[PDB]
Nucleic acid binder design. Structure first.
Ligand SMILES: [K+]
Ligand SMILES: [K+]
Ligand SMILES: [K+]
Ligand SMILES: [K+]
Ligand SMILES: [Mg+2]
Ligand SMILES: [Mg+2]
Ligand SMILES: [Mg+2]
Ligand SMILES: [Mg+2]
Ligand SMILES: [Mg+2]
Ligand SMILES: [Mg+2]
Ligand SMILES: [Mg+2]
Ligand SMILES: [Mg+2]
Ligand SMILES: [Mg+2]
Ligand SMILES: [Mg+2]
Lengths: 232, 128, 467, 50, 53, 160, 190, 75
RNA sequence: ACGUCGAUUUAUCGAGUAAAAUUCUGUAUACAUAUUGAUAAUGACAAUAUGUACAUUUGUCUUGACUAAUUACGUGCCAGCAGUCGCGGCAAUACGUAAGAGACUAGUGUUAAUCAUCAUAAAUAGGUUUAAAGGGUACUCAGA
RNA sequence: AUAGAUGAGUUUGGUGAUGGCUCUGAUUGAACACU
């Protein structure tokens, strides 16, 4: 598959940082996955650090390798989209072969199909990473002026990022409110609060805090992973 | 069987199957030590023919069994402390045990080059 | 109209029997049985509100491939609407008159749906079919008559007019038979309904249960055109034909048929009766003195207003579309509830069922109406207080899309003679083989030639009479 | 159960399915039997039903 | 909340598309389960007594 | 009782195995409720209670039965019209689950799992064409009709 | 093109009506190979009975059985006899069968189940060859009563031809049989 | 595995047309009849590229792609 | 190293990118420093981080089918192999050597045991004419 | 927790059944032999 050009990576960076456009709009604009747009910015930020710290870049290795891989320059010359930004995960519940008997003249919609697979399943209209595109397409069917539909799309996506940033803000703010940092001569003790009664109805609970009493050491079991699972 | 017949306990365990090495299977032991009472020869059954080297061993438990001597040539005789392991000589009735060749008194085949672990033989030690 | 829009439009109103209609769904068949034999399956609001939702629902399914409508008893299929109830409502002030106006809305809304139905629609005329029963049948591509069938529109006798779709079906009928059946309110029985043209096929009353079991087996492909689907059913209905009677002859044929075309071609009732008097008078070359004299006695015993009004729509009905017809009939029938003839005729001949004497029409006779008077103008002027009928769909057509499954009429025989040079007997066989042996083609075609054809170039050529 | 299984009432169904696709994938199916379109709209009648 | 939702579904109206596409079952068969005493039981017992005698 | 449902399940199998157009059943409230459910699912064609002789075939659904009093209750009988399509019966198998020796009851959590081809309890997942009937407080419903109504109950039979 | 100069495919070239180069593109496999014997007035006569399946790989499969005194002549008979007995096998989304099927052949009962995509061919060796040759990719099978090498193939091949047709079941009951998976993704996902 | 869904189809249709007919969808004529008529039939309503097989078999060794030593070799 | 060895059609096929050699890294570990287990104070012993430095073994089973993998020679129902079926009686792919091949590896095989295989005690979920299994009989308390 | 359900060798002149045995999978607070 093709790879973003060296210049294309800058077009994405200069768009999210300088123009401050939402990542969703940049993803839909260039048809680049939101997970890739976020990664390109992280990698670009490191380059700014290296260039700021006067570190030698691997330019000879970069130019030689970029000539061996197909590329997709963004901007004016947009011959094809980079990848599919509307890929939905195949939920195991939706993989079942179900032939539900219904009346001969029923209007079986995607909403009805989600309930058939399960009562807690959502339709594909809600599993998209940029669900604003559907609303944008619904405006074109009504023959709404194009650039006006683009205006609503930006406001919709721009407003959706605020809500996300607002949620994580309150979360992080509520996580530091439960920590009591007491400075001492050597270290800073961090006393975290928690409801010690949330141990389920029989003491067994995944999210409980403590070292479970009635368990022996599993170090002698096969396939006992002892490697760091998460580098946070 | 109706449900009422299953309440009264009609599903009893299947009849036990005799083990290959009862002396070892009974006490959950992988091997047992014993003193040879007799070292002789056994005759194979209908299809096979030859002479199988067998030894009447008295295990530490007290039972007397007939073990098989694997390999070519043995150095055990009356009043020899040899180790016994499970197995059987399929063409010899009554022989339901084997003898480890790298055992206490039984010595492994000296001129063995293939599958030395099965016969308790040390490496030739030529280039060593 | 969606499902909800139909569920809330045809909500059951108080007084509606739960089992007025009996619906059934077989493999490919959807039947509609009118279950009211105590009253000869007379249509009413309760019975119409149950059929409209089903028809709209079956139209959204690709499983239902053949729709059938039939009666319950062994005597009647649908013996007209409940016009007797409307008479009482009409005498309860203006608001009580609008109740009847809304009833005709349901009827016309249903009959329009049947006419523009997007699925094969069959109708078993196993019994008397009058009034509302004619609205559910004439607009269908298949109308099966039987030995028990009795067709008639006795609406001019009660002061009313041909109610539903008669202003679209009768005018574009071979010859002047339409206006005759409407004005005179003739009575056709048995195979005569099949020869006249009202019915498309003719089966026995006992072979209908076997026809349904077969119609349910027919499984058409989703890519077949509506034409193919009708062709498959037409061929199936003809497999159960046991043959028309051997002695029964065409009632309206030969002399009588010609007389109808010579006395029902004018636009004034005065001229029509004037022509009949000549035929009735002995010595006329027609030879129908018996029929003519009987017809006059029947015309002088009906509301003169309905005659003028009925004949008026027969000439205009030939210029309207099926959709525009129902809308006009709505405004047309709405002014009859206010008139005096309808309220008098219904109360005198149906509620009183022959008591107190005959109905007394406001104009005692036609001669009373002076020649220059035009009483047919008021009944064709839409008023503002009556909203225009809002049909369930937007389909319409000037001519029937598929009305060629019945016996060949004058229209089919004429064109066949212009495209070719068939002979007297060679032309009859052309229709027989072209019709795949349909019962009655040899007799029907022969009758048409005997009336509207001559021996132009001896035995070889055959041309029409009117030059 | 000695008698053989007669599938004569399904010749159209069976024959039509065999003509929908070609054995050699990627090629168009060959022309079907000349009778497949003759009885297309004449299905058998229900039999063996007391 | 979980109670009202469940109680609401167990007492919900039938689907319209499923009411307009179901064959009719006469109420004389699907609802006349009660079997009342024969109204003519007394008259029949008197007539049966004469016949048996 | 439940014994009537087992006799009814086996009878409808034998009737469809014999390719009979009509079939009779004892007139009981329990039998009628299951019959209506089968009709609401499209497995049978008609339902009508009458005498020991079947009604007129042509006017089956139009046949108006007489009142069921104590003078003729012993003779009443339910007449169901069987269905056959494509050289095969629509009601081939009617394997029961709840027998007189044991009444198998299912919970809403289990019916949700069985309705999608996954075993639960003493039941097995439903496949293409199969249909399960459950007796609940809201009448004899279908396993999928009982899932929308959020109720469980006695499992009567399984139709293939 | 010199491919078939033995004359074996000539007769088959007429019945099937297709090139010889295409007959070699089929997936053939000798599943069963029995050594039967018949006692006659001239001593035992030992024959080889072989069953061979021929499949196109995209929904066509055929089963052929033959025997002879030579093991080679028997395989050629079944091969040609299996390529002319090919039948279209319906499959859901070109990857699995419709619903569950259970067939019995004289004490050998086979039960086939349709599994979701990506499940794989978690079946025995004989069922793996047939499914792999017909185009089936996700399936589960179990032998309930007996595991006869021959009757297990006859039952399996007979189950693939006894799948419940969803369209016929629908017209029989008068109700739709909407496939949920096709509506959820707006089209079949092969 | 994943499935690509375009918003254009989601906006116009709601998945009802996929159930038309008998549940599986409206049937179309066989292949030996379509081109026989010079006119092709109307396009079937569905998402673009919605009949291509997905290669699940090739994902047998996907878990190995998550290791840190393999990821370096693939970059 | 335009060398060595193994086979064998004496010119073909292998050992073989294997080795040597060259270019890098510094993993376990060693040493050194700092922090830390603990604080009011107390460190038995060690962990963690950083820096520098070092390139160190093969072993075992299998090879008729089940079951992935071959020849040659010797022995001749002998010696022996074997989980099941079985192999060996003078031209043995099954025994014993040699080589090759298949596979696991600081482990590898064997023995013993448990679960599953086994719907092979079947509540879910079996069966009893001829294959293990219908009681000699049905009146009948308890019980279903 | 919605992917989870699998066989193989061996009775017969031969076929199809019934029915055990063994193998294939995982494991041990294990032991022994060669390492
Ligand atoms: K033996
Ligand atoms: K009738
Ligand atoms: K068995
Ligand atoms: K007995
Ligand atoms: Mg070796
Ligand atoms: Mg280190
Ligand atoms: Mg092998
Ligand atoms: Mg060995
Ligand atoms: Mg043997
Ligand atoms: Mg050897
Ligand atoms: Mg280790
Ligand atoms: Mg006794
Ligand atoms: Mg006895
Ligand atoms: Mg014998």
């Amino acid at each position: 598959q093709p790879v973003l050009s060296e210049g294309s990576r800058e077009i994405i960076y200069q768009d999210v940082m300088e123009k401050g456009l939402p990542i969703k709009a940049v993803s839909a604009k260039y048809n680049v996955d939101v997970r890739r747009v976020a990664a390109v910015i992280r990698l670009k930020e490191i380059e700014k650090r290296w260039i700021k710290e006067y570190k030698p870049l691997a330019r000879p290795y970069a130019r030689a390798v970029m000539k061996m891989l197909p590329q997709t320059v963004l901007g004016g010359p947009d011959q094809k989209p980079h990848e599919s930004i509307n890929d939905v995960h195949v939920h195991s519940y939706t993989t079942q072969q179900l032939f539900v008997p219904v009346s001969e003249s029923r209007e079986f919609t995607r909403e009805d199909a989600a309930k058939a697979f399960g009562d807690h399943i959502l339709p594909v209209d809600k599993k998209l990473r940029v669900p604003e595109l559907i609303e944008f397409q619904k405006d074109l069917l009504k023959e709404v002026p194009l650039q006006e539909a683009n205006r609503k799309f930006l406001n919709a996506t721009a407003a959706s990022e605020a809500k996300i940033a607002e949620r994580e803000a309150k979360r992080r703010q509520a996580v530091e409110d439960a920590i009591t940092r007491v400075k001492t001569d050597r270290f800073e003790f961090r006393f975290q609060e928690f409801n010690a009664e949330n141990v389920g109805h029989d003491g067994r609970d995944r999210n409980a805090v403590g070292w479970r009493y009635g368990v022996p050491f599993p170090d002698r079991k096969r396939s006992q992973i002892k490697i760091p699972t998460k580098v946070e | 069987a109706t449900l009422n017949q299953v309440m009264r306990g009609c599903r009893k365990p299947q009849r036990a199957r005799h083990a290959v090495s009862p002396a070892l299977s009974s006490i959950k032991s992988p091997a047992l030590k014993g003193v040879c009472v007799k070292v002789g020869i056994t005759r194979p059954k209908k299809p096979n023919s030859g002479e199988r080297k067998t030894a009447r061993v008295r295990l530490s438990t007290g039972k007397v069994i007939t073990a098989y001597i694997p390999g070519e040539g043995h150095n055990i005789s009356q009043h020899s402390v040899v180790l016994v392991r499970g197995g059987r000589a399929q063409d010899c009735p009554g022989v339901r045990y084997h003898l480890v060749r790298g055992a206490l008194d039984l010595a492994g085949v000296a001129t063995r080059m293939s599958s030395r672990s099965k016969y308790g033989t040390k490496k030739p030690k030529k280039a060593s | 109209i969606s499902t909800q829009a139909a569920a809330e439009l045809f909500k059951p109103v108080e007084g509606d029997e739960p089992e007025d209609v009996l619906f059934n769904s077989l493999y490919n068949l959807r039947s509609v049985e009118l279950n009211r034999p105590a009253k000869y399956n007379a249509l009413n609001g309760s019975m119409i509100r149950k059929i409209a939702p089903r028809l709209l629902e079956w139209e959204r399914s690709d499983m239902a491939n053949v729709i059938v409508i039939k009666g319950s008893g062994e005597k009647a299929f649908c013996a007209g609407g409940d016009v007797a109830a409307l008479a009482k409502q009409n005498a309860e002030g203006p608001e009580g008159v609008k109740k009847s106006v809304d009833y005709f809305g349901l009827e016309y809304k249903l009959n329009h749906l049947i006419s523009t139905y997007t699925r094969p629609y069959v109708a078993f005329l196993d019994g008397i079919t009058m009034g509302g029963g004619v609205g559910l049948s004439i607009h269908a591509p298949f109308r099966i008559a039987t030995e028990r069938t009795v067709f008639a529109m006795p609406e001019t006798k009660i002061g009313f007019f041909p109610d539903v779709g008669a202003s679209f079906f009768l005018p574009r009928m071979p010859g002047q038979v339409g206006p005759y059946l409407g004005l005179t309110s003739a009575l056709l029985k048995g195979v005569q309904v099949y020869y006249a043209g009202i019915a498309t096929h003719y089966l026995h009353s006992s072979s209908l249960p076997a026809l349904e079991s077969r119609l349910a087996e027919l499984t058409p492909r989703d890519y077949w055109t509506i034409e193919q689907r009708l062709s498959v059913i037409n061929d199936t209905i003809e497999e159960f034909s046991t043959g028309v009677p051997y002695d029964e002859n065409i009632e309206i044929g030969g002399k009588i048929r010609l007389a109808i075309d010579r006395c029902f071609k004018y636009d004034k009732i005065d001229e029509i009766i004037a022509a009949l008097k000549e035929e009735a008078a002995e010595g006329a070359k027609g030879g129908v003195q018996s029929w003519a004299k009987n017809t006059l006695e029947e015309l002088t015993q009906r509301s003169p207003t309905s005659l003028h009004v009925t004949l008026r729509q027969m000439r205009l009905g030939k210029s309207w579309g099926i959709a525009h017809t129902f809308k006009r009939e709505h405004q047309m029938a709405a002014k009859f509830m206010k008139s005096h003839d309808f309220n008098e005729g219904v109360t005198a001949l149906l509620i009183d069922k022959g008591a107190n004497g005959p109905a007394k029409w406001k104009p005692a006779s036609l001669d009373e109406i002076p020649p220059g008077a035009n009483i047919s103008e008021d009944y064709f002027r839409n008023d503002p207080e009556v909203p225009v009928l809002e049909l369930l769909n937007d389909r319409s057509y000037m001519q029937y899309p598929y009305n060629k499954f019945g016996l060949p009429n004058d229209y089919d025989v004429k064109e066949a003679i212009e495209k070719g040079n068939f002979t007297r007997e060679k032309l009859i066989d052309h229709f027989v083989e072209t019709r795949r042996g349909k019962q009655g083609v040899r007799e029907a075609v022969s009758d048409v030639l005997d009336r509207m054809a001559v021996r132009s170039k001896g035995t070889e050529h055959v041309q029409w009479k009117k030059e | 159960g000695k008698g053989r299984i007669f599938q004569a009432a399904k010749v159209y169904q069976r024959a039509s399915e065999a003509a929908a696709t070609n054995i050699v994938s990627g090629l168009p199916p060959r022309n079907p039997p000349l009778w497949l379109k003759a009885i297309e709209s004449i299905p058998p009648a229900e039999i063996n039903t007391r | 909340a979980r109670y009202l939702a469940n109680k609401r579904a167990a007492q919900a109206p039938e689907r319209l598309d499923e009411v307009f596409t179901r064959a009719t079952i006469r109420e004389s068969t699907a609802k006349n389960t009660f079997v009342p005493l024969d109204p003519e039981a007394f008259v029949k017992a008197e007539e049966a007594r004469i016949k048996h005698a | 009782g439940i014994q009537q449902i087992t006799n009814m399940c086996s009878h409808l199998q034998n009737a469809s195995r014999a390719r009979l157009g009509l079939t009779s059943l004892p007139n009981t409230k329990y039998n009628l409720a299951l019959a209506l459910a089968l009709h609401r699912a499209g497995f049978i064609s008609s339902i009508t209670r009458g005498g020991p002789h079947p009604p007129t075939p042509e006017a089956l659904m139009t046949y108006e039965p007489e009142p069921v009093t104590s003078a003729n209750v012993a003779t009443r009988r339910l007449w169901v019209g069987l269905k056959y399509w494509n050289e095969e019966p629509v009601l081939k198998e009617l394997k029961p689950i709840s027998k007189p020796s044991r009444l198998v009851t299912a919970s809403l959590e289990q019916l949700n799992r069985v309705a999608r081809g996954f075993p639960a309890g003493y039941m097995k997942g439903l496949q293409l064409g199969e249909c399960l009937f459950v007796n609940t407080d809201r009448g004899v419903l279908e396993v999928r009709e009982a899932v929308e109504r959020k109720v469980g109950g006695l499992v009567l039979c399984k139709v293939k | 093109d010199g491919l078939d100069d033995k004359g074996q495919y000539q007769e088959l070239k007429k019945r099937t009506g297709m090139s010889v180069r295409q007959i070699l593109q089929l997936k053939t496999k000798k599943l069963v190979h029995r050594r039967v014997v018949n006692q006659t007035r001239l001593g035992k006569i030992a024959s080889d009975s072989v069953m061979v399946i021929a499949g196109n790989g995209d929904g066509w499969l055929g089963l052929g059985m033959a025997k002879s005194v030579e093991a080679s002549i028997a395989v050629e008979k079944a091969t040609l006899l299996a390529i002319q007995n090919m039948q279209p096998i319906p499959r859901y989304e070109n990857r699995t069968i419709y619903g569950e099927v259970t067939t019995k052949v004289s004490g050998t009962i086979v039960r086939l189940n349709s599994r979701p995509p990506g499940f794989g061919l978690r079946v025995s060796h004989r069922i793996f060859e047939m499914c792999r040759a017909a185009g089936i990719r996700d399936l589960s099978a179990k032998f309930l009563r007996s595991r006869n090498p021959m009757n297990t193939v006859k039952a399996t091949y007979q189950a693939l031809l006894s799948q419940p047709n969803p369209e016929d079941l629908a017209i029989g009951r008068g109700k739709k049989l909407v496939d949920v998976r096709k509506v959820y993704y707006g089209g079949s996902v092969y | 595995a994943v499935v690509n869904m375009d918003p254009a189809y989601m906006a116009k249709y709601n998945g009802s047309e996929q159930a038309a007919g008998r549940g599986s969808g409206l049937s179309e004529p066989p292949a030996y009849e379509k081109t026989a008529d010079e006119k092709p039939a109307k396009q079937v309503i569905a998402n673009p590229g919605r009949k291509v097989p997905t290669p699940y078999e090739q994902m047998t060794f996907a878990p190995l792609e998550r290791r840190l030593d393999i990821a370096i070799f693939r970059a």
